[PDB]
Design a binder for this molecule. Structure first.
Ligand SMILES: *[C@@H]1O[C@H](CO)[C@@H](O[C@@H]2O[C@H](CO)[C@@H](O)[C@H](O)[C@H]2NC(C)=O)[C@H](O)[C@H]1NC(C)=O
Ligand SMILES: *[C@@H]1O[C@H](CO)[C@@H](O[C@@H]2O[C@H](CO)[C@@H](O)[C@H](O)[C@H]2NC(C)=O)[C@H](O)[C@H]1NC(C)=O
Ligand SMILES: *[C@@H]1O[C@H](CO)[C@@H](O[C@@H]2O[C@H](CO)[C@@H](O)[C@H](O)[C@H]2NC(C)=O)[C@H](O)[C@H]1NC(C)=O
Ligand SMILES: *[C@@H]1O[C@H](CO)[C@@H](O[C@@H]2O[C@H](CO)[C@@H](O)[C@H](O)[C@H]2NC(C)=O)[C@H](O)[C@H]1NC(C)=O
Ligand SMILES: *[C@@H]1O[C@H](CO)[C@@H](O[C@@H]2O[C@H](CO)[C@@H](O)[C@H](O)[C@H]2NC(C)=O)[C@H](O)[C@H]1NC(C)=O
Ligand SMILES: *[C@@H]1O[C@H](CO)[C@@H](O[C@@H]2O[C@H](CO)[C@@H](O)[C@H](O)[C@H]2NC(C)=O)[C@H](O)[C@H]1NC(C)=O
Ligand SMILES: CC(=O)N[C@@H]1[C@@H](O)[C@@H](O)[C@@H](CO)O[C@@H]1O
Ligand SMILES: CC(=O)N[C@@H]1[C@@H](O)[C@@H](O)[C@@H](CO)O[C@@H]1O
Ligand SMILES: CC(=O)N[C@@H]1[C@@H](O)[C@@H](O)[C@@H](CO)O[C@@H]1O
Ligand SMILES: CC(=O)N[C@@H]1[C@@H](O)[C@@H](O)[C@@H](CO)O[C@@H]1O
Ligand SMILES: CC(=O)N[C@@H]1[C@@H](O)[C@@H](O)[C@@H](CO)O[C@@H]1O
Ligand SMILES: CC(=O)N[C@@H]1[C@@H](O)[C@@H](O)[C@@H](CO)O[C@@H]1O
Ligand SMILES: [Cl-]
Ligand SMILES: [Cl-]
Ligand SMILES: [Cl-]
Ligand SMILES: [Cl-]
Ligand SMILES: [Cl-]
Ligand SMILES: [Cl-]
Ligand SMILES: [Cl-]
Ligand SMILES: [Cl-]
Ligand SMILES: [Cl-]
Ligand SMILES: [Cl-]
Ligand SMILES: [Cl-]
Ligand SMILES: [Cl-]
Ligand SMILES: [Cl-]
Ligand SMILES: [Cl-]
Ligand SMILES: [Cl-]
Ligand SMILES: [Cl-]
Ligand SMILES: [Cl-]
Ligand SMILES: [Cl-]
Ligand SMILES: [Cl-]
Ligand SMILES: [Cl-]
Ligand SMILES: [Cl-]
Ligand SMILES: [Cl-]
Ligand SMILES: [Cl-]
Ligand SMILES: [Cl-]
Ligand code: NA
Ligand code: NA
Ligand code: NA
Ligand code: NA
Ligand code: NA
Ligand code: NA
Lengths: 94, 94, 94, 94, 94, 94
């Protein structure tokens, strides 16, 4: 019979920067093994965050260039925001 | 044999408001196609956030009125909080 | 045939503390029923957050002691951070 | 993702008649527990057979009135055929 | 997680020949829709058989040229065997 | 969600004996690789049969000592029956 099921892979990426600020942007290659049968959807969020109150909080994350083989885990802050530590969490399911 | 498997659907909803503040609350209808066989559980978080440091950070998100056909993706801030941009991420699995 | 599928369980844990600050750390036992066939991966994030702007925002969450039977849902802030309310979201898939 | 999988149930029904001939026809109610999600296809054959050479061999089997709840396991010989023993085998998959 | 599951398709092919004998051999194209993801294994048997006792009983069946798209359902008797009616049953699973 | 799915393995075993009669009984060890997660059900039938009309047709087949690792594929005729060739077909699903 026809059914809908998903294969899900997930992970975290910790950036401990203090006593230095974290880089304004980061891109990390993530690989799926074995590759997915169909290109999965991927969502990204934050599991840990350390942001300076001296300026507004501006954080961004995304899954870029997603393929059955993997994707690029992306993060960036912008303008005057200062980020001291962060941990990205992500999950990919087809 | 009896096994436990999940069908998962996921997505994001970007609210680019700057140079205006984002609305205090938002509700967006999300549809599952085809509908789930059992009502799924849904969780929501933030993939991007831009909050003014002039006041405390207060952000809320939830999946309301969840059915096999879809749900209402909810967001709201409260009191003096000013949110300039945000991206909700959500995942529904049964 | 050999295929990759996941069983996913998910949930939320709301901590409404205002008018008192939330405890600096929290650990909650989460049980999977029935237990997973293989130990799942678990990721945790925030669905709601209320942080005082008087100090930097420092929030942390993790899934500790993960087994097929469950895990310990962990949260903590640190240093001068004051958290008034928060809701953890988590998802475990094998 | 969309995949094709089957739930299969199977069984046997032994008719030891010797020293008497087996009845010309037999119908046995078979129940599926729990019921199938979609009506399955069912095929029937013989795992054991004892037929007299005094006449031609004529044996028939079928799955009748198939539903998600079960079916009627049918057997019959015809004309001058004499059957002394037989075992039906069947398999139902959706 | 890695699991083993099968998609199974099955069917029957009835040859009512009496009052003429069935052809010594038969080959019928069977199509799978949609095609299998991996080439399946296929087995064939008899659900009904009518063989003359004037000579030995010799019946053969097989699944030939099996692909993800289908296979050739084969039957044949040989030498002096006379077959008056038969029904093939088959099941293909990956 | 809880669903019912099966892993199925199948095979055939050909005994070409002519010009000698096949042994009265045969037992062949069949191995499943990798082993099943739950003990499967197994059914056995005939895909090809060559029986002498000089005596009644008596053929038997069964799956004995079934475990997650395999089973013993069994066949036997009895009394005066003479079998010249046969092919067993079998399918195991959990
Ligand atoms: C968050 O990161 C994503 C990924 O880098 C950014 O997306 C880009 O947005 C620009 C325009 O805003 C587009 O031209 C690019 O094509 C997008 N890239 C991808 C891979 O989608 C996004 O702008 C970032 N958001 C913030 C607030 O920094
Ligand atoms: C976050 O959003 C949810 C959904 O709107 C809010 O939940 C409501 O909470 C009130 C009381 O606090 C209940 O009476 C409603 O029934 C709830 N609605 C639903 C659909 O569950 C929640 O209060 C919001 N949290 C914050 C801090 O704003
Ligand atoms: C977030 O919480 C996790 C879980 O308590 C912390 O992880 C511990 O980190 C220390 C060193 O930093 C290790 O010695 C422990 O073994 C870790 N525990 C576990 C269960 O992994 C983590 O340090 C916390 N992060 C922050 C910024 O507070
Ligand atoms: C084998 O058994 C099936 C099931 O009883 C018989 O099928 C019936 O066939 C007659 C006409 O031949 C139809 O009118 C009925 O509707 C059929 N019943 C069902 C449930 O399909 C079949 O005839 C038998 N074959 C032999 C050779 O005896
Ligand atoms: C049963 O049918 C199969 C399929 O036609 C026959 O298999 C062929 O056997 C010959 C030699 O015996 C081989 O050269 C062919 O390559 C086989 N064909 C295939 C597709 O496998 C088999 O011989 C038949 N058995 C009987 C007793 O008639
Ligand atoms: C068909 O083969 C099976 C398997 O050998 C036979 O089953 C045995 O039957 C006897 C009594 O008839 C029991 O004492 C044994 O325990 C059974 N063995 C198993 C493994 O179940 C069956 O008798 C045979 N049938 C014919 C007609 O020969
Ligand atoms: C150029 C630039 O980054 N501008 C940013 C804008 O994108 C928004 O984040 C705003 C409120 O925090 O702060 C600045 O104006
Ligand atoms: C009425 C109201 O919204 N009150 C809020 C309270 O809910 C909490 O967010 C607190 C700390 O940030 O700020 C205010 O007091
Ligand atoms: C000892 C301690 O907690 N130190 C913290 C450090 O970990 C980091 O959070 C920094 C920036 O916010 O604030 C403090 O220095
Ligand atoms: C009326 C009747 O049953 N006729 C049968 C016919 O169906 C077929 O089986 C034939 C050859 O064996 O034997 C008889 O003629
Ligand atoms: C040439 C030929 O078909 N020979 C057949 C042989 O294959 C076998 O079936 C035997 C016993 O029934 O009958 C004949 O001898
Ligand atoms: C002792 C023995 O094998 N007896 C068999 C009996 O089991 C049954 O097969 C019958 C009809 O064919 O033929 C013989 O009597
Ligand atoms: Cl950490
Ligand atoms: Cl420090
Ligand atoms: Cl996959
Ligand atoms: Cl600022
Ligand atoms: Cl954006
Ligand atoms: Cl700007
Ligand atoms: Cl579904
Ligand atoms: Cl405030
Ligand atoms: Cl709340
Ligand atoms: Cl208040
Ligand atoms: Cl499980
Ligand atoms: Cl501070
Ligand atoms: Cl028996
Ligand atoms: Cl006897
Ligand atoms: Cl089912
Ligand atoms: Cl006759
Ligand atoms: Cl018929
Ligand atoms: Cl007739
Ligand atoms: Cl398929
Ligand atoms: Cl002959
Ligand atoms: Cl052969
Ligand atoms: Cl010969
Ligand atoms: Cl298995
Ligand atoms: Cl005899
Ligand atoms: Na960094
Ligand atoms: Na808005
Ligand atoms: Na608390
Ligand atoms: Na009977
Ligand atoms: Na024919
Ligand atoms: Na033999």
């Amino acid at each position: 019979r026809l059914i809908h099921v998903s294969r899900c892979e997930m992970g975290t990426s910790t950036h401990r920067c203090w006593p230095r600020p974290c880089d304004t942007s980061s891109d990390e290659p993530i690989s799926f093994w074995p590759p997915f049968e169909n290109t999965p959807n991927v969502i990204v969020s934050f599991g840990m965050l350390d942001v300076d109150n001296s300026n507004n909080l501006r954080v961004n994350s995304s899954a870029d260039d997603v393929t059955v083989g993997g994707f690029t885990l992306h993060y960036n802050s912008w303008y005057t925001t200062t980020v001291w530590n962060y941990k990205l969490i992500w999950i990919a399911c087809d």
